[PDB]
Amino acid sequence: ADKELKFLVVDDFSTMRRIVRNLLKELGFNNVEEAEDGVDALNKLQAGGFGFIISDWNMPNMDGLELLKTIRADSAMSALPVLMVTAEAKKENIIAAAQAGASGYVVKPFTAATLEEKLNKIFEKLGM
């Protein structure tokens, strides 16, 4: 993976976005932009050049699953890796997200080591 890959961190909590941005930084990924909910993220992804999405499952207006489904249906972005973040793993949640095309899932709070493993896994799975 290019350390310059442009990440989009999506969450309605500012502080969780700042945590994620800081974890990424710690791994050498400094190209990060933020969005507050699903529609805000889609507005931003329009501009182009993003290479990886980290989205929270639970967001108002357009939740994680809906944003993932919109990204997967879009011819120009359908291959973008999407890591879903949740506060609690639920079997039906994991299945719905996988079937909708999620690249992986992580339960918060998490550390840099955990995030690193998740990223490495996705890059491995996608051959990046």
Q: Which residues are known binding-site members?
A: 11-12, 56, 58
β pairing state of 7-10 and 32-35: parallel
Gap between the Cα atoms of 104 and 49, Å rounded: 21
Find, among 77, 75, 73, the residue nearest to 48 by Cα: 77
Which residue's structure tokens are 């507050």?
36
Per the structure, how many domains does the chain have? 1
Q: Which residues are known binding-site members for Mg(2+)?
A: 11-12, 56, 58
Q: Which domain holds residue 108?
A: 1-128
Q: What is the resolution of this structure in A?
A: 1.8
Give the determination technique.
X-ray
Q: What is the CATH number of the domain that holds 77?
A: 3.40.50.2300
Q: Using alpha carbons only, what angle is made at residue 119 by residues 14 and 76, rounded to the nearest 5 degrees?
A: 80
